[PDB]
Amino acid sequence: SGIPIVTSPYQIHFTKTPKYFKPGMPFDLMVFVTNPDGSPAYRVPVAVQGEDTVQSLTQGDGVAKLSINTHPSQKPLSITVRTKKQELSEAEQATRTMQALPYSTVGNSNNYLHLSVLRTELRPGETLNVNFLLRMDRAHEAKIRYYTYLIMNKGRLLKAGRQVREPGQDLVVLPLSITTDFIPSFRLVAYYTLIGASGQREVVADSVWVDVKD
Amino acid sequence: SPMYSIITPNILRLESEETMVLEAHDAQGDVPVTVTVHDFPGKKLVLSSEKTVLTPATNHMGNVTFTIPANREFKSEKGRNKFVTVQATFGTQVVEKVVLVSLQSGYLFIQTDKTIYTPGSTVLYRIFTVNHKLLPVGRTVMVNIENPEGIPVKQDSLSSQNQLGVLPLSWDIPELVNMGQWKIRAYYENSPQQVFSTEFEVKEYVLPSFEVIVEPTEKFYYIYNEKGLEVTITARFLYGKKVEGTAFVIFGIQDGEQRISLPESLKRIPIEDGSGEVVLSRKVLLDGVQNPRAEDLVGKSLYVSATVILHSGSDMVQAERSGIPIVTSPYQIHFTKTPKYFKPGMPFDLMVFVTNPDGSPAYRVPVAVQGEDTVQSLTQGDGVAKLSINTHPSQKPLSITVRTKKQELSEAEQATRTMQALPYSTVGNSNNYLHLSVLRTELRPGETLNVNFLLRMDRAHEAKIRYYTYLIMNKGRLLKAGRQVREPGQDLVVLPLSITTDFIPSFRLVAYYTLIGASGQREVVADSVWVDVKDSCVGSLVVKSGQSEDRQPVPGQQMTLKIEGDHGARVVLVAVDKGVFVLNKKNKLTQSKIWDVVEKADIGCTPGSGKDYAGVFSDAGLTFTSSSGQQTAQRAELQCP
Amino acid sequence: ANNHIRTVLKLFRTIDLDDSKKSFYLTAAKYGIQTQLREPIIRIVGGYLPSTKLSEACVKNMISEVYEIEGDFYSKFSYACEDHAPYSVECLEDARDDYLTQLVELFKETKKCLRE
Amino acid sequence: SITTWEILAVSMSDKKGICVADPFEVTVMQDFFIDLRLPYSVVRNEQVEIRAVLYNYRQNQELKVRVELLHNPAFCSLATTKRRHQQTVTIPPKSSLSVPYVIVPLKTGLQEVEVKAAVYHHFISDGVRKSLKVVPEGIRMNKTVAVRTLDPERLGREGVQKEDIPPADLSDQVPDTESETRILLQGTPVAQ
Ligand SMILES: *[C@@H]1O[C@H](CO)[C@@H](O[C@@H]2O[C@H](CO)[C@@H](O)[C@H](O)[C@H]2NC(C)=O)[C@H](O)[C@H]1NC(C)=O
């Protein structure tokens, strides 16, 4: 029992997609396409309605990578996903719309932070690379000299460490050791701190969601 | 004034479709251009067709496709390098750059049904004719068969027209022939200097009845080990049954081309249940050679020459395994994939090619940098372990040494290697860099990819750049060009990429932009990267048995076998008894050999980056010429040093 | 059983083939009939209780039609060999394919005589 | 042949490219068969033994195999037109056996030998007919008939050259044996 009667042979979910995007940096979309019954679909070409040249194929986990080029504007950003699998009409393809809100800083100083992560069927032992994308003017760029990142597996502080960053670099890379104790997911949380505005302490943080093979 | 840029492959091929991407920067309106090709020296007017106009709507982008004709003038001289001139007429502006022209015009693959043939027996071989894009082509093939002493015995002149790239041929060996290593050699008519070959041997053999494989526990022998080398004999009948016989083993040291035997290592181990073992005490190995020194043995090799006899005294099979190294370190480090030029103040990639002593890639072995050893990684299934080092913004060259950090081993056994990388050099010391950080994993066709363009420039010149230009090599020629836009202020731009089945096996990606800097001097900053793709068929051909029941078919009983392949293709089949593979298993053909040949036939040999923009383009296998005067280096050698 | 196998052997020893035809052809045809219409049939027949009764009318029909099909094979081998020279081993091997295919399809069809 | 076959498939697609399949293995095995092991070539008029192996890969059943060597006029074994060379051997299950025979070749060319086996208390037979090559006694030796340099301007004058090649006597050549004679032509490359 439970065989559905749906006019669309595919479904689209946005449960894994972040609901807040940093303006002016790549906002990643975790499209979660599944079969009508509930099983995760595999190898279907998802795409954005605008600039159809962007497209990708889902991995074995039922999630497909995506990448957009957000404009540096504070207006709300809307994404709609429409699969473009061939040999089907324009009505069979599933559609879904989503409205994302921009990250809001303190004092409107545009002190952002982005943290992009490799997203595939990760395994314990295999190394990982995270990119720390700072965004500040060169007037206050030299004050920051380090990063602080936290790892949370099963709701506890699995590992806390400091990643150093020499002044002048617009990004750094932090190698990560995914042992068998990171199963099944973890959330990096990176933040820095500095004096900002005209004598007001400022903190900017970020987080990311990563899946590990169960 | 707007600059016109023409990008062409650094090496041209006769009778092939070679693209020439035409791009204009800061162009105004439609700018028609006609591309012409002239011989060097002189002016023979080989081809001047395929003119194209430019449109600002398409970002002033366009590629012209043609084919250089094959004439007797090119074939008149075959012993010296020849060049041609490509000229473009961008309206009232003229640009022309010389380029080397090679004679390679495809590949030849020779498949023989067997590998050993008795005198008086027929020979059946097929000649596969493919072009530089690995497609069927209609050309003329000369085929010659050479005896071991080097005397042609039979020559032919075939044509691949209407045969869909497959030429079946036969030859009858005379009943009275000198045995040895016979050779079959074939070459295209246009390029007689390029010779392809295979090797089949004539022997006075009779088919054996079983296969003997000697598999040592580890593919090496630690010098300080006290137990000594261990080798396991696994004799198995051809039709899937076990053997009950006796075996002889002899161990010999293979140094250079001279084989030294050990009389005292001979043993008579009774193989039971199709399995057996024999030891070699280190004392015997030490005393067998004249010098009792230990370190002198490093660099040499051992070989096992096992002879298996059945209890019935019916058949004897000699199985030999050679090339087991004698290395004090159970791992090796290679830097054939790591870029030789980093970018100051920018993340740097270190692909380490960790491999077993024999040559096979390793798997799941930790590696680490000597300094700040907190960075660790594990080799994937391909024997490549990713690394990442943060580089200080200093013009001084940086030295990196890597050392494996596997547990349960001492500090002496870990392999070490040292590498010196030179910093990227800009123009006028303007401190303008570009880096391209990309995923390097076991990529497959269809799965997406995320190129990370990482611009680095001062805020005073972050607005002039409004786009990017990227190119994709594959098998020596371009595959796809395009423009990736970038609005001002967006430091990072991501370019989604579709890896189709046509990107096999390794596509080299380049990227560059342009602007006006310093005090009005035009300049270009470029970058390149090397990416691997899974080595597999462009199509998908699978052979499987239709009959799922009636296990172990009786001889004389039919079966039906399915051929699952792409529609419209031609399939050639051959059935070979495994006895001949027991008696000779070398000089076969497989997908790995084909991809190795294709990779060897490339044009560039530097895995990304370079000394400068001209160096980057020269290493990536492209020549870049500008209307203003900016140009790459000059290439005049077919094989890179 | 054993009596059934004796009866089957008696039926299969009544097959009369020309000696005048080529020796290699005769060996090929005999080997084909032995390995595709005797071995499976003898294996099937041997696994019967002694009390079970065996039919013979359509087995004699089998013999008549195997005569005629071997005659047609010899016809294809002798003069209907257009691809190569008459009485050459090449077209003998070529026609062996459909000869064996027809024989196995015949056995699959006739497997219903062995039990009434 | 009782062995395993390897099938290698190669495609040729006008649109996709070229592919080479992974090898396919089919194992043709029977519960009872004969593997006649022969030297590749023997010498005329000199006794050489031959070995016939009677494999048996059934379950614990025992086989009372009867093997015979049918007479051939091209060999001198114990089998004649009237008399027959029969043996009644027993093969323990999951084991083997080797029945030796003595054969003396008579005429050169390409002769054949064969054995036939019939199982008692069952009905299954397998005969193997292989061909062993017979060569008259002798070895390989290659004397040069003649070697000369072709130069009509330098040899023979008048821009012409007539060369006489005397045939080799070959008084020691084996009777009724073929003898090839390869003729090689090679120019003199002069340059600079
Ligand atoms: C290089 O030339 C090829 C020649 O076909 C171009 O491929 C065409 O691209 C357009 C749009 O980009 C498609 O509508 C056509 O269907 C393509 N042709 C074929 C045969 O598929 C390619 O676009 C050119 N490169 C650039 C950068 O324009």
Ligand SMILES: *[C@@H]1O[C@H](CO)[C@@H](O)[C@H](O)[C@H]1NC(C)=O
């Ligand atoms: C605390 O943080 C350090 C940082 O290196 C980490 O090594 C350690 O495992 C963490 N837990 C404890 C109890 O120290």
Ligand SMILES: *[C@@H]1O[C@H](CO)[C@@H](O)[C@H](O)[C@H]1NC(C)=O
């Ligand atoms: C005669 O044959 C031998 C191989 O047995 C080989 O060296 C060559 O063809 C001939 N010998 C000489 C000395 O030319």
